[PDB]
Design a protein around this ligand. Sequence first.
Ligand SMILES: Nc1ncnc2c1ncn2[C@@H]1O[C@H](COP(=O)(O)O)[C@@H](O)[C@H]1O
Ligand SMILES: [Mg+2]
Length: 241
Amino acid sequence: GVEKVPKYDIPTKKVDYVFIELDKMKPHQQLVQKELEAFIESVTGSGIFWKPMLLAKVPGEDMYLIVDGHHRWAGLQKLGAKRAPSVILDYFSDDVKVYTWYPAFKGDLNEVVERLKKEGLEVIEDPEAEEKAERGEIAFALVGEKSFAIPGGLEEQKKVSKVLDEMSVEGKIELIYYGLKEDAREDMAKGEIDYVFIRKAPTKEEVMELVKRGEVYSPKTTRHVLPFNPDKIDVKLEELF
Ligand SMILES: Nc1ncnc2c1ncn2[C@@H]1O[C@H](COP(=O)(O)O)[C@@H](O)[C@H]1O
Ligand SMILES: [Mg+2]
């Protein structure tokens, strides 16, 4: 998929799954086309669904927040499936932490900047962009050899993400999402990427607040962390109808 594999593999736990209906699941963020496509081709080609979704009960509603699994959920719905193997978490437990994913690309800076500006964004050379972004003062810092601030907030984060999605689909860039900006910097030094987009992470209270208002974030805004990753499961795609 589109995400960089973590450098350190956290413990696994055989937590087992429960089937939950896809129509009881509530997204909190947008999709990346290449992530959706890769999931659909993997599950249909292999015939096996091997990673359970992460869910949490929405306060006041007979619905589950999609904690992790937007592309699995959208892809399964598109395929015509009914349900997905899921793990129901306690969202406000201290054993659910949240960080973010940083969009990054291998490709031409000037082409990306041109496309961002055509979308109506400002891209301002600014040596303090990274720390402004970490403080949540701008939508993203675009950082590599050079440093740019992209002013704004949620709407601007969506416009940035849309441009990257389109350029990825067009083949103009390789789009990769990093859990840790230091990993992006390390890969930048190896020539594996050119630029990373830095943003402040959301809080769990902000995520549920946004979900309750019926809004969504730009893709990969939340990176939820548990004390483990669930072990692989072995569920036939046909069992999901
Ligand atoms: N055959 C498969 N069964 C279940 N999950 C998969 C499969 N192939 C890829 N994935 C995962 O699907 C996820 C796509 O993003 P998301 O569903 O939004 O978390 C990634 O975590 C992939 O590791
Ligand atoms: Mg995911």
